[PDB]
Amino acid sequence: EKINSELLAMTYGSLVTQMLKDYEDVAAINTQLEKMGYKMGMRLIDEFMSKSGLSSGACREFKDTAESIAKVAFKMFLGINANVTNWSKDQTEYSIVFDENPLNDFVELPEPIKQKRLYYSNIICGVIRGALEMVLMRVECEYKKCPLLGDDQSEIRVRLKEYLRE
Amino acid sequence: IEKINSELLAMTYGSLVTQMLKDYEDVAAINTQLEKMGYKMGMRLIDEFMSKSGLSSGACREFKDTAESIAKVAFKMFLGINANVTNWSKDQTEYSIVFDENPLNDFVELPEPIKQKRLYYSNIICGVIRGALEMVLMRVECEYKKCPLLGDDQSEIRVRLKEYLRE
Ligand SMILES: *C(=O)CCCCCCCCCCCCCCC
Ligand SMILES: *C(=O)CCCCCCCCCCCCCCC
């Protein structure tokens, strides 16, 4: 709902504001926002699985995670419609692109923060990594494009590092 | 609202409190900054609440009216919490909002020295109340008095009217 989405956006906005006071190094902020999401995603995967109706085999292959994240997870948690593009030939990498992001609403980065490329929503990358670890996939996930930095759309890259064994 | 969105909000807020708790020696300042974050949010949120709640401007004429509006409508709409009003003052300028469950508190355990320092983990709620009511021209003071994370039997938030404001 819009009001709960506004409330989440403002809460996360308070977090990023706090990080900008507590850290002088934007790279450090990016790293900690991602580590914060990582812990969340390990806990969020259970809510996603139950409320999505997906089975374990919907998560057997790395290739399958693109549609689940872009078409289900993004709508469920952020109300965003995302698309999958830029597949690698070996299908170990894909990009998730989207033109809207409720966390970005009413946000304006000061010029030095833009030039140093803060990824305001970097927490999303951590959530993906932590969630996918729980279905036994170790991935790297990083932002490449964000309209707050003057880019034409948002793009997040997801790369498979290894399949895990329990 | 829905569990997955409420869990997601609880975890995002939890990362905020966790980041602030690095400043472990001035817990009072943490309480205050959490309130100021809520204060700014509540000024921005009040208009949306009025719209989704269907309340008119005259629904907010008297301070006594805010108690049911916050405890019974806002708390359900924003946190999924059912709350109750108690401990009215004789002149109806003070009431408390009491509740036994709080989704922001889920799976949270404060270390013993933080409990002794009386962190109010959910203090952002007090600021939301203060900022929202300012927009309907009430200057209020709103503080936590009891929280189960500190060993209390329930949550209690005190709301006190300081003055009716002028446009
Ligand atoms: C099998 O393929 C499992 C799918 C993994 C679900 C991933 C959920 C992540 C969605 C992004 C949520 C970002 C929330 C940010 C909060 C501030
Ligand atoms: C007229 O007097 C109407 C009363 C104003 C209602 C204000 C709504 C308060 C919202 C409380 C919930 C705080 C949410 C905390 C988010 C982390």
The CA-CA-CA angle for residues A103, A72, A3, to 5°, reads 40
B37 in reach of chain A (CB within 8 A): yes
> Does residue B76 belong to the interface with chain A, where contact is any CB pair within 8 Å?
no
Order of strands across the sheet with A83-85? A83-85, A93-98, A154-163, A137-145
Length of chain B: 167
Q: What's at B147, amino acid-wise?
A: C
For residues A99 and A80, what is the distance between their CA atoms, to the nearest angstrom? 9
d(CA A130, CA A132): 6
CA atoms of B107 and A148, how far apart (whole Å)? 34
Cα–Cα distances (Å) from A110 to A113, A115, A116, A144, in that order, read 5, 9, 10, 19
Decide if A86 contacts A95 (C-beta within 8 A): yes
**What is the 3 state secondary structure string of chain A?**
CHHHHHHHHHHHHHHHHHHHHHCCCHHHHHHHHHHHHHHHHHHHHHHHHHHHCCCHHHHCCHHHHHHHHHHHHHHHHHCCCCEEECCCCCCCEEEEEECCCHHHCCCCCCHHHHHCCCCCCCHHHHHHHHHHHHCCEEEEEEEEECHHHCCCCEEEEEEEEEECCC
* Number of other residues whose CB lies within 10 A of the CB of residue A5: 18
Handedness of CA A134, A140, A146, A148 (dihedral sign): positive
Q: Is B49 near chain A, with CB under 8 Å?
A: yes
Establish if B41 touches chain A: CB-CB under 8 angstroms.
Answer: yes
Burial of B131 by CB count in 10 Å (0-12 exposed, 13-18 middle, 19+ buried)?
Answer: buried
Round to whole Å and give the CA distance between B153 and B156.
Answer: 10
CB of residue A26 inside a 6 A radius of ligand 1:
no
Are A3 and B44 an interchain contact pair (Cβ–Cβ within 8 Å)?
no
The residue nearest atom 16 of ligand 2, judged by CA position, is B125
Strands (E) across B64-137 are located at 84-86, 94-99
Cβ atoms of residues A104 and A90 within 8 Å = no
Q: How far is the CA of A32 from the centre of ligand 2 (A)?
A: 31
Question: Which of A6, A18, A39 is closest, CB to CB, to B16?
Answer: A18
Cβ of B7 within 8 Å of Cβ of A123? The answer is no
Beta carbons of A33 and A122 less than 8 angstroms apart: yes
Set out the domains of chain A in order of their start, with CATH numbers.
1-166 (3.30.1380.20)
Residue B49 Cβ contacting ligand 2 at under 6 Å? yes
Q: Across the interface, do A76 and B4 touch by the CB < 8 Å criterion?
A: yes
The rounded distance, in Å, linking the Cα atoms of A98 and A80 is 7
Among positive and negative, which fits the CA dihedral A140, A55, A63, A60? positive
Give the Cα-Cα-Cα angle A57, A77, B8 (nearest 5 degrees). Answer: 105
Q: Give B83's DSSP letter.
A: -
Count of CB atoms within 10 A of residue B103's CB?
A: 15
- Count Cβ atoms below 10 Å from residue B50 Cβ, excluding itself: 18
Probe residue for ligand 1, chosen from A78, A127, A133, A139 as the CB with the greatest number of ligand atoms within 8 Å: A127
Q: Which residues pair with A157 in a beta bridge?
A: A95, A142
What experimental approach yielded this model? X-ray
